Amino acid sequence: NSASNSSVLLAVQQSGACRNVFLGNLPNGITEDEIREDLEPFGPIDQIKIVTERNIAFVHFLNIAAAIKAVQELPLNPKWSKRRIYYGRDRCAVGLK
């Protein structure tokens, strides 16, 4: 089959957002070091703020393309697919973006 299921394909059809990446479905205990080491090989990040209390993380990918490939690869990966990531509209992209 070919569907979203628990993956945000609604996010893969988006663009036009540099450094703007929001993760809203992480496990408790997730640390930036993990996301860094995982996302930096395709997209180096300068700012990663994880609110484990709400299972959400705000990532800032310095290069626009770094965010693109990362946000496109995150949903395709077994670890990151567990998380809901999209291009953050505006800076307050946590619910209303």
Q: Describe it for me?
A:
Negative regulator of sexual differentiation. Acts by repressing the transcription of meiosis-inducing, ste11-regulated genes until cells reach a critical level of starvation. RNA-binding protein that preferentially binds poly(U). Residues 19-90 form the RRM domain. It comes from Schizosaccharomyces pombe (strain 972 / ATCC 24843). This is Negative regulator of differentiation 1. This protein is an alpha+beta fold and 97 residues long. It has a single domain (1-97), classed as Alpha-Beta Plaits (2-Layer Sandwich), CATH 3.30.70. The chain contains 3 helices and 4 strands, in the order αβαββαβ. It has helices spanning 9-12, 32-39, 64-73, and strands at residues 21-24, 45-51, 56-61, 85-87. Strand 2 and strand 3 (56-61) form a beta hairpin. The chain is globular. The relative contact order is 0.27.
Structural class, judged by helices and strands? Answer: alpha+beta
Q: Main sheet, how many strands, which sense, barrel?
A: 4 strands, antiparallel
Q: For the terminal residues, how far apart are their CA atoms?
A: 30 Å
CATH architecture: 2-Layer Sandwich
Number of domains: 1
Percent helix range: 10-25%
| Rg | 12 Å
Overall shape: globular
- CATH domain topology: Alpha-Beta Plaits
Summarize this structure briefly.
The PDB classes it as rna binding protein. This protein has 97 residues and is an alpha+beta fold.
Note the topology.
Elements: H1 9-12, E1 21-24, H2 32-39, E2 45-51, E3 56-61, H3 64-73, E4 85-87
Antiparallel strand pairs: 1-3, 1-4, 2-3
